[PDB]
Amino acid sequence: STIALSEIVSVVNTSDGRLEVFGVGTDKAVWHNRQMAPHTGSPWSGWSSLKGQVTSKPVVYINTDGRLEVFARGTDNALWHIWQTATNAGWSNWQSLGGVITSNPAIYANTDGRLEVFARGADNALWHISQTTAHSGPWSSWASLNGVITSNPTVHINSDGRLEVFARGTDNALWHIWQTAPDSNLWSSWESLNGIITSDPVVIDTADGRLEVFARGADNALWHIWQTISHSGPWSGWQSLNGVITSAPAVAKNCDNRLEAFARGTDNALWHTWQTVSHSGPWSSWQSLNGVITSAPTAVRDADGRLEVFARGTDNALWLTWQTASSWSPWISLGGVLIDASAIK
Amino acid sequence: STIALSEIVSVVNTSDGRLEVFGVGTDKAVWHNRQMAPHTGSPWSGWSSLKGQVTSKPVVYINTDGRLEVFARGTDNALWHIWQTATNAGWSNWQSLGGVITSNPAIYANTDGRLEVFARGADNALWHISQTTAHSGPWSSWASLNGVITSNPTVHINSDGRLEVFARGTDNALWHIWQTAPDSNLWSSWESLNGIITSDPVVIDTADGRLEVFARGADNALWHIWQTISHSGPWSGWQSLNGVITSAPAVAKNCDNRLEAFARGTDNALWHTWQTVSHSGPWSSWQSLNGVITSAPTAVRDADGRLEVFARGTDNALWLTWQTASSWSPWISLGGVLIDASAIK
Ligand SMILES: [Cl-]
Ligand SMILES: [Cl-]
Ligand SMILES: [Cl-]
Ligand SMILES: [Cl-]
Ligand SMILES: [Cl-]
Ligand SMILES: [Cl-]
Ligand SMILES: [Cl-]
Ligand SMILES: [Cl-]
Ligand SMILES: [Cl-]
Ligand SMILES: [Cl-]
Ligand SMILES: [Cl-]
Ligand SMILES: [Cl-]
Ligand SMILES: [Cl-]
Ligand SMILES: [Cl-]
Ligand SMILES: [Cl-]
Ligand SMILES: [Cl-]
Ligand code: NA
Ligand code: NA
Ligand code: NA
Ligand code: NA
Ligand code: NA
Ligand code: NA
Ligand code: NA
Ligand code: NA
């Protein structure tokens, strides 16, 4: 019935190589901030309001034509969205995709360019809806993929083009379900990956085409589990990455594909652990990046191939640190006053 | 009526992070070779025949479901192809897509997952054909995009999803034509980018979403030209990268997005020049990677984020060198006996 403290912004590296960050202000509007230039340490726009009135984390996704699109639950509990009219232009108005949802939305593009959105319903099953044509409306009707879930869902694509969704179940195990063909409405049954998880799951694709899922465990360590064959079962056992974490974990890939995980520690600093040597190499010990943070961190690789990490500060502004040749940069403030609007806490 | 010596293999980093290389043997069959493991320096399969009888460079492309597909002109001058039945499985038979073509095929996926293939016709115009549905046959009818071209064409996608094709014209200038909308059959007119080029052009997308085109000039230097705005004109002037090159250039992106160009030099060694500092930084002087090569080089970034470069040797085998922390590795031989099967020489 609870999860580790959430990430509170959605961030992407856009089609022109600039990071762009989306969050929620105290009066429930979505705000965004973007780099002026496609480089680590670029000046930022500052926060600009996309208006709306949201009751979930707003989640941005890039259409296959490069246009950003933000999805969020509205005050009426419908799924709403707003999109760029062109990659380097302004935004539509907020429009409703209806339904009644009870989680943050999770988004992925099918191999045919149609976005598909997954969200928990009032019945605690996973529901979904999709664009009927590539990178465009109109959208399909809502339908259910069943299950009973207790965390925000997350979706990824397999290296063979099949979407796969992960969520915590009523028993606190990690569950998943997958497309049996790309672009299709043919799905598997829900299957348990076992474990006991106390955060939303995070999923990423490895350099070698396997899904790998991360989540906080019952012992507050970071745990992970992965496909042992490219786009295929069986899965590994759950394996611990140790640490003691007090937020959801965030994961990104370095530019050499080494995975790196980030989370708040018991001292409220940002901590991280990373694969060493290569993308098949052993994980480092947890090490501190300092800061005093009041959310999970959010990690992304920028256009210079460096990881940048965003986290809310004690002042409720969004702060930022990034990799340097030697080390990491000191935390800098991007201002704003942000809230955790997660539909599941 | 001629072009600089061509690249003689087609290489990709596949859905499971392994490099895979395609070439042509002395009896006109297509052969391929792949890394066992997703890492720099992996053992290789060795050469395996995909049979066929080709009269162009064979060009591999990855469908949006991860399956490889190889395109080549047949002995009957039709476009032929062969594809993986699944990403980690075997291949179909060679099948004909008809037409009569007079260049190597150039391939890209539209944002809706449909591959589109461009090839010069008997009239020296650019013709095209596409999959009617994402990552699958059947294919459309052939049609023409007009123009009069004197090099192999190359296609890329803009950061807004619009395909764009580049080719040398009768006047030896660089010409181009583009989709006016993603996934569409609406194209612009051919427009000249001027210059005088003496190789096939090479095109790549920058980290900041601009197309940048490279080609040998009339003075045998490497020249380049780029979109000055993301997915948009106007283009820059032609600018020289200096050097004296005796093959077509090859270009790839380092894992921090710095572009790096490769070509054979006057001493028949492999030479290279790269952006320094960042993807917006100045280009280095040309420096040697040694070797004695009998083709243009072919460059690709591997699953460890390192560039690997392939080139035919004096013995007609394919040789290989890659980036190390300090330097580059000594050339090693992958064997085989390869030919330049380019439909335009
Ligand atoms: Cl607000
Ligand atoms: Cl609005
Ligand atoms: Cl509906
Ligand atoms: Cl995730
Ligand atoms: Cl540790
Ligand atoms: Cl990038
Ligand atoms: Cl600091
Ligand atoms: Cl809050
Ligand atoms: Cl042969
Ligand atoms: Cl065959
Ligand atoms: Cl036809
Ligand atoms: Cl190219
Ligand atoms: Cl020089
Ligand atoms: Cl890779
Ligand atoms: Cl050597
Ligand atoms: Cl030859
Ligand atoms: Na942008
Ligand atoms: Na980008
Ligand atoms: Na996801
Ligand atoms: Na999340
Ligand atoms: Na492969
Ligand atoms: Na790959
Ligand atoms: Na191309
Ligand atoms: Na080429």
Residue numbers in the entry:
A (entry chain A), B (entry chain A): 25 to 369
Task: Kindly provide excerpts from the paper associated with this entry.
PHL, a homo-dimer lectin (~ 80.4 kDa) with subunits linked by a disulfide bridge, was characterized as a dual-specific l-fucose/d-galactose binding protein with an unusually high number of potential binding sites. PHL forms a single domain structure, which exhibits a seven-bladed β-propeller fold organized around a seven-fold pseudoaxis of symmetry. The results of biological activity assays suggest that PHL significantly affects host defense mechanisms, specifically antimicrobial effectors such as reactive oxygen species and their production.
The structure of PHL was solved using the structure of the lectin PLL from Photorhabdus luminescens. Each repeat of the PHL lectin (W-motif) consists of a four-stranded antiparallel β-sheet connected by relatively long loops. The shape of the PHL lectin monomer is a short torus, with a diameter of 45 Å and a height of 30 Å. The tunnel in the center broadens from 13 Å at the C- and N- termini side to a diameter of 18 Å on the opposite side. The overall structure of the PHL monomer is very similar to the recently determined structure of a homologous PLL lectin, with a backbone RMSD of 0.65 Å. The dimeric state of PHL shown by AUC was also seen in the crystal. A pseudo-2-fold axis of symmetry generates the dimer associated in a “tunnel to tunnel” manner, so that the C- and N-termini are exposed to the solvent. The main dimer-stabilizing element is a disulfide bridge formed between the Cys279 residues of both monomers in the loop interconnecting β-strands in repeat W6. Additional hydrogen bonds are formed by residues in the loops of all repeats except W5. Interestingly, site 2F is occupied by the Met60 side chain of the symmetry-related molecule in all structures.
